[PDB]
């Protein structure tokens, strides 16, 4: 995951941050249709280096961090 690959804790992040059926991969409005910079959540420039952190991708999808919308 982290400290390896580059997009292991990012792709799986949303796949595990949105839940198991919702994670809208930049579905809701993008910025260059994937590719070409990605200054926002660094979902592609996060662990890519050594930052498998989050606190940003939790707003990419899912109705809310914890269960239940509200």
């Amino acid at each position: 995951g982290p400290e390896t690959l580059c997009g292991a804790e990012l792709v799986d992040a949303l796949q595990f941050v949105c839940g198991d059926r919702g994670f809208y991969f930049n579905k809701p409005t993008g910025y260059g249709s994937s590719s070409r910079r990605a200054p926002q959540t660094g979902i592609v420039d996060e662990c890519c280096f050594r930052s498998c952190d989050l606190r940003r991708l939790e707003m990419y999808c899912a109705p809310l961090k914890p269960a239940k919308s509200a």
Side-chain angles (χ1 to χ4, degrees):
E3 281 197 76
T4 146
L5 271 305
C6 144
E9 217 147 356
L10 325 190
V11 184
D12 214 294
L14 329 197
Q15 260 99 251
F16 161 57
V17 159
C18 197
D20 248 79
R21 259 236 54 209
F23 12 57
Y24 323 103
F25 208 135
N26 182 263
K27 239 171 217 202
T29 83
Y31 306 89
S33 22
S34 141
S35 322
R36 314 178 132 143
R37 239 173 308 144
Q40 46 223 58
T41 320
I43 210 247
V44 189
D45 274 332
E46 263 251 48
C47 217
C48 225
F49 328 142
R50 269 222 246 288
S51 334
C52 252
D53 73 81
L54 297 83
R55 194 259 231 40
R56 195 54 252 205
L57 59 67
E58 246 300 2
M59 318 241 281
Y60 257 24
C61 185
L64 212 86
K65 155 147 150 179
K68 181 139 63 106
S69 291

